[PDB]
Amino acid sequence: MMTGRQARAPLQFLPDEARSLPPPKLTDPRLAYIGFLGYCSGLIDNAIRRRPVLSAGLHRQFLYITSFVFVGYYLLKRQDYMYAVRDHDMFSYIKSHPEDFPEKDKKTYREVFEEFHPVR
Amino acid sequence: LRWQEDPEPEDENLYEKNPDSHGYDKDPAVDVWNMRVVFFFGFSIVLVLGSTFVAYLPDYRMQEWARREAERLVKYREAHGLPLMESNCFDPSKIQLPED
Amino acid sequence: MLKYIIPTMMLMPLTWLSKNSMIWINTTLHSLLISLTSLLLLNQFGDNSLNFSLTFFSDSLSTPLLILTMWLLPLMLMASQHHLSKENLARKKLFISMLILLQLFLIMTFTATELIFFYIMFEATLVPTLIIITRWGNQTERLNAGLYFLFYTLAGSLPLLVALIYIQNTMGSLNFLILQYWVQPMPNSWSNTFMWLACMMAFMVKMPLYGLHLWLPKAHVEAPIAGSMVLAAILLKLGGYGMMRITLLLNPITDFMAYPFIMLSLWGMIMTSSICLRQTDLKSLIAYSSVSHMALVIVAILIQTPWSYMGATALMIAHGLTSSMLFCLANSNYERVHSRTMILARGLQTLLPLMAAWWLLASLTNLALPPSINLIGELFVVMSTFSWSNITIILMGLNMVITALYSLYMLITTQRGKHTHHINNILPSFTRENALMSLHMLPLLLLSLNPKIILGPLY
Amino acid sequence: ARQWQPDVEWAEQYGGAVMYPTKETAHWKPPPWNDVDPPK
Amino acid sequence: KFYIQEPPHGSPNWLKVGLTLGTSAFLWIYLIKQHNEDVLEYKRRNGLE
Amino acid sequence: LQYGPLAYILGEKTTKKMTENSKLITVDGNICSGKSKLAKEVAEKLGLKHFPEAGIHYADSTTGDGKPLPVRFSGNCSLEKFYDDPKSNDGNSYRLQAWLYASRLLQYADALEHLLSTGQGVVLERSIYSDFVFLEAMYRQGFIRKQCVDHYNQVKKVTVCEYLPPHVVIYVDVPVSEVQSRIQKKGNPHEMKITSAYLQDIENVYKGTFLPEMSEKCEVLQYSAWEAEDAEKVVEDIQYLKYDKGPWLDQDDRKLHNLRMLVQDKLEVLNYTSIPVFLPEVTIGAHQSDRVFQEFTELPGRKYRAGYNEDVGDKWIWLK
Amino acid sequence: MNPIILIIILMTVMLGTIIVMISTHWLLIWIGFEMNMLAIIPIMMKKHNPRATEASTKYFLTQSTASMLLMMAIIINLMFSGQWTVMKLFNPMASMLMTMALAMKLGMAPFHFWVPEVTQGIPLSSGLILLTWQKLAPMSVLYQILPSINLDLILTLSILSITIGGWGGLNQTQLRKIMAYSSIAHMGWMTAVLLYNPTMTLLNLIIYIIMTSTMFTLFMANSTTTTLSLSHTWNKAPIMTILVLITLLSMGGLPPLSGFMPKWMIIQEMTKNDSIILPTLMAITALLNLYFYMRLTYSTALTMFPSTNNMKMKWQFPTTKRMTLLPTMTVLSTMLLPLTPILSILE
C-alpha cells in the first residue's frame, strides 16, 4: 500500500523524518515485553540443553534480554514511524480532497426518527 | 505375552500412616498447615470478612439514594398538584415529529 | 483490572519457585487472597459501569462471574491435590500453571472492553482446558473428548471472528461502551440473518445449545475434577456473558431469529433432564443437568427482558456453585470406589453421614429450593418466559418436576438404601473434602441473604 | 485406576504408511528408517 | 573428581563469557546513547528545550 | 563441540595422523576361547588401545562417574538369568541381546572416535559385526522368536551400514569340548548351565556366516587355542599383512571427516537402536518408562548436563 | 560433502534468491531462479540414496518447467511492452503464465504434487531450506507483479491450496509430508491476501517461516521423521514435547499464540474488501490443519506412548546437536501476538 511512499529513498530502516518523532521510552511496556521474551528464550536455552534453568549461564540470559531489547527498540521506532506516516498521508489526502470528505450535517435526536421495536 | 509394564499400584489410605490426617498431604506437618491455610484464609478471611464487606457495601447501585430521591420528587409534586409521573419521558416541545 | 491480572500472573513464579511440599499450600493461600481482593469490583453504580481503562471495564454482569472465577481456583487446587499426589513435581506445577493461566484468561475475558479482545481471551481459554482434559483426564476417551471440545468451539467461533471484524469495519469500533451509543438497528435480511448466526452460534456452542451439546458429556465427564469444576462453573458462562454483550447489536432481528433456538432450548431442557433420569454414570448425569440448566439461560437471554437477564445471571452464578459442588461430591465417591457408575456404591449415608448432608444440600440447590439463588434465577426466568408466552409454563413446570426427580434419584441411589456389601474401602470423609463442600455451599447459601449483587446490570 | 496411557494397540495406528488405509493404499509399506533403499 | 571423562562444560569458557558480557554491555551503552541522541534530536526538531 | 566443520576447514585432517599402525583389530572367538588376553597382548605389542568387551554396563563406564549403574537403569536385562532361564517368559534373552548390540555399537563408535581423532589403533573384542552370531545361536536354540530376529536385523540394517569394518579380524578356533572344559574350570555357576548345542551354534555361525562374509571386506586371521598363546606370531602376522580389501582404501579426508562427525555424536550413533517397533521383549510401557526415567534423573550427576551438577561439586554454573 | 563446498553452494542458493529480490530486469529474475535451482540440487542429494535422487529429479522437472513458463511470460511481456522492467505485466496471457510458473515454484495446488514427495525424499535440513527459503523468491516476484495478477486465478489457487493442503495432511504419519501439506495450506493463505494487502502476505510468510523453522529444528534436534518416533520424545527429552506442543498449537492458529496473528490479519484485510464468504471458508478449512497438528500433539506431548528398553542408553548422553536459534524461534513462534501491531514494519 505505502510502498511507493518509501520508494524514492529505498532500504531505509528509519528515515530522517523519523527523527521528528518521539522515540519509545526505555520503560515502554512493549519493550519490557520484548525483554521478557528474551528472558524466556534464555530459560528455554537452559532447558533444552539440560542446564539448571534459572541459575546456569546468567551472562547468556542477560545477552538474550539485551539482544531482544536492542532489536525491539528499533522495531518499535520503525512501527511508530510507519503509523505516523499512515496518519500523515491520510490527513494530507483528506485536506487535499475536500469534495470526497464533506462535513456531514449532524442532527440531534429531536429531529432523528428511529423506529421503535417493542420487546414483548 | 505383552510388554514390560509396572503393575497397578494399590490405592493408598492416608489414615493408615497418619490417623489424624486432614487429607491434604502425607506429611502430617504439611497436612496440618495446609488445613490451617485453607480454614483461616478461606473461612476466617474470605467468608467472614467478605460477607461483612458485602453487607456494608456503600449503597450498591444507588438503590437507597433512588428511594430517597423518589421521596423528594413525590413530596414536590404531591404538594404542587402535579401528576406523580408523566407518560412522556421527554418534553414534547423538544421533539420534532416526522410530518405527514 | 491490572490489580487482579498481575497477582494472577505472580501465582506463576509462586508455584514454580515454591518448595516441593509447599506448592499446594502457597497457591491455595495466595489464590484465596486474590479471591478476597476480588470484592473491590462491587463498586458498581446504578447508571454507569465501573470503567477502569480503554481495555477493561466491569459492570454488574462481569463482576459476579469474576468473583466466582477467582473463587473457583483455590477450590480447584483443593479438589485436585489428592489425585495428583503421586504425580511428577514438574507436571504438578504444569497442572497448576494451566489452572492459573485459565484464571488469567478468564478474568480478562469477562472484563474485556473491546469485543475482539474478548474473542481472543475467550478462545485463549480453550488451550489450557484442552491440555488439562487430555493430559490429566483419567481415561482413553479424554483424547476424543479433547477433540469435540476443541472443534465444536472453533467451528462456531471462527464465524464470530469474521462477524466481529465486520462490525469493526462497519461501526469503526468494537468497544462495548462505544457500541452502547452507536448501535444501529439490524433489519430483516439474509445478510443480517447470517450476521446473527455468526454472532450467536459460538456462544450457543459454549452454553451449550441443545443439539450442539454433545461435546459437554464427554468434556466434563472425561476431565479431571478441576477441569470439570471450571468447565461447568465458568466456561459455560462465557457463552451467556457473550450473548448478553452481543445481543445489543442484534436488534430487532433477534425477535424472530430466537424462535428456533428457544424451541431447541425449551424442548431441550425437557430432553436432557429426562436423560438424567436414565444416566448410569453419575458424572454424566451432572453434565446433562448442566445442559438442562443452561437451556433456561439461553431462553432468558433470547427473550431479552429485564427479568430474564436478571434471572439468567442469577442462574449462571447459582449453577456455577451448585454444579461445581456436585462434581466434587461425585469425585469424592470416585476417589474411593474408582468408578463413576452411580448404582455401584449405594447406602453411603450409613457410612458417610456429613457428606450425605452435603449431598442433600447440593441436591436441594440443584432442584432450586427457595430461597436459594438457584430458585431466584429459575423463578425469574419462569416469570419472564410466562410473559413471553403463557404456554411456556407447561414446559417450564414439567421441567421442574423432572429436575426434582433426577435430583433426588441421584440422592436416593448413592446415599440411601442398603450399602453395597463387597465395597469396604469407604474411608471417612477427609477434612479437605468437607472443606471443599463447605466452600462451595456456604457462599451459595449466603448469597440468598443479599442476592442483589448477582442480579446483573439491570437490577 | 491409574491414568490410561496408550498401549501398543493405540500406538500401532500411527505407524502405518498412511493414516486411513483404503483398498488402494493397502500395499504401501512405511519407508525405511534411515530413508535408504537397497541398490537392487 | 567425579566424572570418568572431563566434560566440555566442566570449566567456564572465559573467552566466551568475556565476549558475552562485553557484547551485552556494548549493546546497552549503544542503546542508551542512541536513545539520548534521539530524544535530543526530537527536542531540537520540535523546539522543546 | 571440539571437532566440527570449522576444525576441518582450519586444517585438522585425519590422514595427517593416520599412520601405518592405525588399525582397528577385532578379536573373535567362542565363550571361553581365551581371546581376552590375546587381544590385550596384541594391544601391548602394537601399542594399541585395548577396549575390553562391551557388557551390559559399557555405557555406564563411559558416562557419569564411570561406575556401573543399577540394572533397572542400564540393561534391564541379566546375562546370568539368560544362563539360568534361556526360554524365559519376561523376554530377557532378546532384551539382553538388543542391549548388548547397542553397547557394542557405542563401543565401536568410541573405537572409531579414538582412531580418527588420535591415529592410534584399537583392539576390540567381538564388535558389532560379530554380535549377530549370538542372535542366530539363540534363534537356533529356540531362545528367541523370529520377530526378535526381524527387529535385530532392522536395527543392524540401519546402524552397521554407517561404519567401516575392522582392518584385521582375529578368530580363535576353540572346540566346544575345550570351551566346556574352560567353563567348568571357570567356576561361574550360571555360565556352567550353557548347553552344548548353543556353543555349537555359536561356532557354526562363526565359521559358516561370519568369517566368510568378513573374508571379503577385511583380513581374517584364524588361530587355534595353542598357536594363539604366542602373541609374537600373531603380531608378526599382523605386521606383514598387505591391506588390499574393504572400504578403508577409498577413505579421503572428507569421508573420514563425515565418519568422525558421526561417531562423536552418541545420540546419532544410538538413534536407530530405539526404533518404534513394538516388540514385547523390548517394549517398555509408559508408566514404567516414566518411573524409571524419573528415578534415573535423581541419580547423582545425572539430573543436568555433566558440567552443571552442584551435588557432585560443579562450580561456576552461573557463568556456564 | 566438503564443508567449503557446502558453504559456497549455500551462499549460491542465497545469492540466487537475493538476485531475484534486488533485480529490476526480468532476465536477472530468471537467472536468480536458475542459479537457485542449480545450487539447491546438491543440498537435496546430500545423502546419496535413491529417494533423494528421485526427489531431486522431480524437483528439477517441476522447477525447470516453471522456469520455461516464466521465460515465455517474460518474452510475451517483451512483445507487448518492448521492455524488461520487473513491474506489472502488459499482457494477461503473460500474467497468467507467470502466475502459473510462480505457483509451480511455490508448489501451490494444483501444482502441489511435488512438495510432499520432494520433501519426504530429502533430509530435514534441506526440507527446511525447501519449505522456507525457497518460498522467498517467488513471493517477491508475486509481490511486484500484483497489478497484473488475475484475481480469479490467484484466489482459485489460494482456496485450492488451502483445501488440498488441509485434506492432504490428515492422512499422513510421516512428518515431512505433514510439513509439506502444511506448507501448501499456508501458501494458499499468503496468496489469498496478496491482491488486497501484500503486507499481510509478508506477515504470513514471516510467521510461517518462523514456525516451520521451529518445527524442523525440533525434528532435527530429536532425529524424528515419523509420528511414532516423535512419540518417543517424552521419555528422552520432555522439554521438546512442550516445545512441539506450543509450536503446533501456534501453527494451528489458536490464540493467544503467534500463528493466530497472520490469519486474523488476513481476515481483517479480506472483510474490508467486502469478501466475507472467502475468509470464512478459509478459516473453517484451516481446522483440518489444526486437526492433524492436534494428532501430533496427542501422540507427542499430551500422552505418553510406550518406549523401548534401549532408550535407557540414550538417557546417559546429552544432545550435542547445534539447535541453532531454537529457543529464540520457539519464543517468536508462540509469544508474539501481544506485539501484533509490529507488522507495520513490513509496509
Ligand SMILES: CCCCCCCCCCCCCCCCCC(=O)OC[C@H](COP(=O)([O-])OC[C@H](O)COP(=O)([O-])OC[C@H](COC(=O)CCCCCCCCCCCCCCCCC)OC(=O)CCCCCCCCCCCCCCCCC)OC(=O)CCCCCCCCCCCCCCCCC
Ligand atoms: C452473614 C451472616 C449469616 C449468618 C446466618 C447463616 C445463614 C446461612 C448460611 C449457611 C448455613 C449452612 C450451615 C449448615 C449446613 C451445612 C453444614 C452441615 O450440614 O452441618 C451440620 C452440623 C450439625 O449437624 P451434625 O449432627 O453435627 O451432623 C450432621 C449429620 O451428619 C446429618 O445432617 P442432617 O441432614 O441431619 O442436617 C442437615 C440439615 C438438613 O436439612 C435440610 O436439608 C432441610 C433444609 C430445607 C428445608 C428447611 C428450610 C427451608 C427454607 C427456610 C429457611 C430460609 C428462609 C428463612 C427466613 C424466613 C422465611 C423467608 O441442614 C440443616 O439443619 C441446616 C440448617 C440451615 C439450612 C439452610 C437451607 C438449606 C436448604 C437448601 C437451600 C435452601 C435455600 C437457601 C436458604 C438460605 C438461607 C440463608 O452443622 C454444623 O456443625 C454447623 C457449622 C457452622 C455453620 C456456619 C454457618 C454459616 C457459615 C458462613 C460463614 C461466613 C459468615 C459468618 C456467619 C456464621 C454464623 C454462625
Ligand SMILES: CCCCCCCCCCCCCCCCCC(=O)OC[C@H](COP(=O)([O-])OCC[N+](C)(C)C)OC(=O)CCCCCCCCCCCCCCCCC
Ligand atoms: C458473588 C458472586 C460469586 C459467587 C461465589 C462467591 C464466593 C466468594 C466468597 C466471598 C465472600 C462472600 C460473598 C457473599 C456474601 C453474602 C453474605 C452477605 O454479605 O450477607 C449480607 C446480608 C445483607 O443484609 P441486609 O441487606 O439486610 O443488610 C443491611 C445493610 N446494612 C448492614 C448496611 C444496614 O447481611 C445480613 O443479612 C446480616 C444479618 C444477619 C445475618 C442473617 C441472620 C439470619 C439467617 C437465617 C437464620 C434462620 C432463619 C430461619 C431458618 C431456620 C433454619 C433453616
Ligand SMILES: CCCCCCCCCCCCCCCCCC(=O)OC[C@H](COP(=O)([O-])OCC[N+](C)(C)C)OC(=O)CCCCCCCCCCCCCCCCC
Ligand atoms: C458450531 C457449528 C455451527 C456454526 C455456525 C456458525 C454461524 C453460521 C453462519 C455463518 C455464516 C458465515 C459468516 C457470516 C459472517 C457475517 C458477516 C456479514 O457481514 O455478513 C453479511 C454479508 C453481506 O455481504 P456484505 O456485508 O459484504 O455486503 C454489503 C451489504 N449488502 C448485502 C447490503 C450489499 O454476508 C455475506 O457476505 C455472506 C454471509 C453468508 C455466508 C455463507 C457462507 C458460509 C455458510 C455457513 C458456514 C458455517 C460454518 C460451516 C462449518 C460447520 C462446521 C464444520
Ligand SMILES: CCCCCCCCCCCCCCCCCC(=O)OC[C@H](COP(=O)(O)OCCN)OC(=O)CCCCCCCCCCCCCCCCC
Ligand atoms: C522480507 C524477508 C527477507 C528474508 C528474511 C530472512 C529469511 C530467512 C529464511 C530462513 C531459512 C533457513 C534455512 C536453514 C539454514 C540454511 C542452511 C542449513 O540448512 O543449515 C542447517 C545446518 C545443516 O546441518 P547438516 O549437517 O546438513 O544436517 C544433517 C545432519 N548432520 O544445521 C542444522 O541443521 C542445525 C539445526 C538447526 C538449524 C536451524 C536454522 C534456523 C534458521 C531460520 C531461523 C528463523 C527464520 C529467520 C527469522 C525470520 C525471518 C523471516
Ligand SMILES: Nc1ncnc2c1ncn2[C@@H]1O[C@H](COP(=O)(O)O)[C@@H](O)[C@H]1O
Ligand atoms: N547371547 C549371549 N550369550 C552368552 N554370552 C554373551 C552373549 N552375547 C554376548 N555375550 C558375552 O560373551 C561373553 C563370553 O566371552 P568371554 O568374554 O570370553 O567370556 C559373555 O560373558 C558375555 O559377556
